[PDB]
């Protein structure tokens, strides 16, 4: 009978969860070792442990069919069993799983091993993306130098892994279908537990898109004045290499040349950080201080003992794209970041420490619940703090921003600077997964794969390669997440919902009142707020124990993902910018790019 079975099932889950945590710890350790120190030996070790865990998961998924779990009374037990049926890549036959893992490490290690030659010195060929190439892309205003580094990087990080990427798509699709999803797109989307999730995002993106187009138009206008019309056209897509970022995903590095009021203050605390002798250690300690100030959890000793917070100085290869790691025991959580002393990096630190906080908050949950309410929730946590960290209010408090007068013009500068990060990124984030979804779904013929990438980047972001590309090139894997098979929709979700969290935390902190000119949303600091911390504790402690609308409700009483809060934040910018574009007769929109030959 079912009553006796459900009692037995509860006991089964309790034991299995603990076993899965312990086994995942072993896999995670091998993965950590590889990412910290890329060698053939560590690759082999990483992949063989995973093959072993995959085999164990196969038996787990099989064993779930012996339980009448869909018949149970307990929603909680049913939810746990459903999680256990989700094999993902582990559904693949033994040999196919091994080949997929070999394919994934080939791509990630290619990306991590990219070195290019100095633009001025063709014999100095040890320049890595992090930090050498990214430093040029962010600081250089020599358009030909920028174009050189763009071409060198994309050729090496993208084109070199076309064959591997093709095999990856094949095996991703096979895995998805073995789980009875149509493709890897539906597999990814399953994480959001909502059959209208794509439409919901389209609707929100459509509401914010006009604001993006104003920002795009104004930026293009200002770039024309800086570089001249031979480099930037009025009516064409923006050459992406001028936007201060290798993927043009965020444009804040060119704020000094595109800011609304060049004679009024523009926040850039990097120089002050260096002057005051800031170190990566100090930056992480400050992040820790922020969380504890909100009555949230202090970083445990294991974090300080085991983390890598600086790029190693030996000869070794490693992945420098920052990462936060949960080892599924108690208090064993780590970051690996190749930390630099900059304002932008200060944000990355808080962003990554948001993951660590999430790990600690839900570590008491059953193994299957020890993850985010949805992938977007995990990415949002640290960004809510970074929003506060970025305010003139907070930066003055900590002594990094000096002699700042917050008049109307400085406010517009700060709003525009934030938008160069937060609004600009939305079409970018959407295209990363629209591209991969279309490949997963079999909607693009292999002969059209590269220009299908650039077509999306054009349609949505209005940017283009600095040079003519073709199907001889393969540019998508030049983005880390694409080489490393990390879903990107999480970030689109995050950038929307982080404003819902931020607005609510700010209200709870007494830091925001729409009817009070002294408390604007764009100058809210939640540092020290126990009330904001209480909301985070309520939501984060839940892990994945309930569907994500329940986790949002626990934070602020709402159940719906909404673009209202992000629009509210930027409304004063929208009003000013619409008027400023009209004032300057700024052309809005772009013609179809000529930069990918079919």
């Amino acid at each position: 009978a079912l009553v006796k079975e459900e009692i037995q099932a509860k006991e089964y889950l309790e034991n299995l969860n603990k076993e899965l945590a312990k086994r995942t710890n072993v896999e995670t350790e091998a993965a950590w070792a590889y990412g910290s120190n890329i060698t053939d030996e560590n690759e082999k070790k990483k992949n063989e442990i995973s093959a072993e865990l995959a085999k164990f998961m196969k038996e787990v998924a099989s064993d779930t069919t012996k339980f009448q779990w869909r018949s149970y009374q307990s929603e909680d037990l049913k939810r746990q069993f459903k999680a256990l049926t989700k094999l993902g890549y582990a559904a693949l036959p033994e040999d196919d799983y091994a080949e997929l893992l070999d394919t994934l490490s080939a791509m990630e290690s290619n990306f991590a091993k990219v070195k290019v030659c100095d633009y001025k010195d063709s014999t100095k060929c040890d320049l890595a993306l992090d930090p050498e190439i990214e430093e040029v892309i962010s600081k250089s205003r020599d358009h030909e130098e920028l174009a050189y580094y763009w071409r060198e990087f994309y050729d090496k990080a993208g084109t070199a892994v076309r064959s591997q990427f093709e095999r990856y798509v094949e095996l991703n699709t096979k895995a998805a279908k073995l789980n009875n999803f149509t493709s890897g797109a539906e597999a990814w989307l399953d994480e959001y537990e909502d059959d209208t999730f794509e439409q919901q995002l389209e609707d929100i993106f459509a509401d914010i898109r006009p604001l993006y187009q104003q920002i795009h138009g104004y930026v293009r206008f200002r770039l024309r004045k800086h570089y001249g019309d031979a480099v930037v056209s009025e009516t064409g897509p923006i050459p992406m290499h001028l936007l201060g970022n290798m993927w043009a995903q965020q444009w804040s590095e060119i704020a000094d040349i595109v800011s609304p009021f060049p004679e009024k203050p523009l926040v850039d605390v990097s120089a002050e950080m260096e002057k005051q002798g800031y170190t990566p250690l100090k930056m992480f300690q400050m992040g820790d201080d922020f969380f504890t100030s909100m009555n949230l959890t202090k970083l445990p000793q294991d974090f300080w003992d085991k983390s890598i917070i600086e790029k190693p100085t030996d000869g070794r290869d490693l992945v420098c794209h920052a990462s936060a790691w949960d080892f599924y025991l108690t208090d064993d959580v780590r970051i690996k970041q190749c930390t630099r002393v900059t304002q932008d990096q200060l944000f990355t630190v808080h962003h990554e420490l948001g993951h660590i906080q999430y790990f600690l908050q839900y570590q008491h949950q059953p193994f299957v619940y020890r993850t985010g309410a949805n992938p977007g929730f995990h990415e949002a946590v640290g960004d809510v703090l970074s929003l506060s960290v970025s305010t003139p209010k907070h930066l003055e408090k900590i002594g990094l921003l000096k002699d700042y007068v917050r008049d109307d013009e400085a406010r517009i500068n700060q709003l525009f600077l934030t938008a160069l990060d937060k609004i600009v990124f939305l079409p970018f984030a959407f295209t990363m997964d629209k591209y991969r979804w279309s490949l997963f779904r079999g909607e693009v013929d292999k002969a059209n794969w590269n220009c299908a990438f650039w077509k999306l980047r054009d349609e949505y972001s209005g940017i283009e390669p600095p040079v003519v590309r073709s199907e001889k090139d393969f540019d998508a894997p030049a983005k880390y997440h694409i080489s490393a098979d990390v879903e990107y929709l999480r970030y689109l979700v995050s950038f929307i919902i982080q404003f819902q969290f931020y607005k609510s935390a700010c209200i709870k902190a007494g830091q925001y009142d729409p009817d009070n000119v002294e408390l604007p949303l764009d100058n809210c600091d939640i540092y020290g707020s126990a009330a904001a911390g209480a909301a985070f504790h309520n939501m984060l402690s839940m892990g994945a124990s309930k569907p994500w609308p329940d986790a949002l409700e626990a934070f602020n009483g709402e159940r719906i993902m909404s673009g209202k809060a992000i629009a509210e934040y930027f409304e004063p910018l929208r009003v000013w910018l619409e008027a400023e574009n009209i004032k300057n007769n700024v052309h809005i929109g772009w013609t179809t790019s000529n930069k990918c030959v079919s």
């Binding site: 990412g35 965020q250 690996k336 990554e352």
Partner: peptide, 6 residues
């Protein structure tokens, strides 16, 4: 898997 910046 590890959680990473955009």
């Amino acid at each position: 898997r590890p959680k990473i910046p955009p």
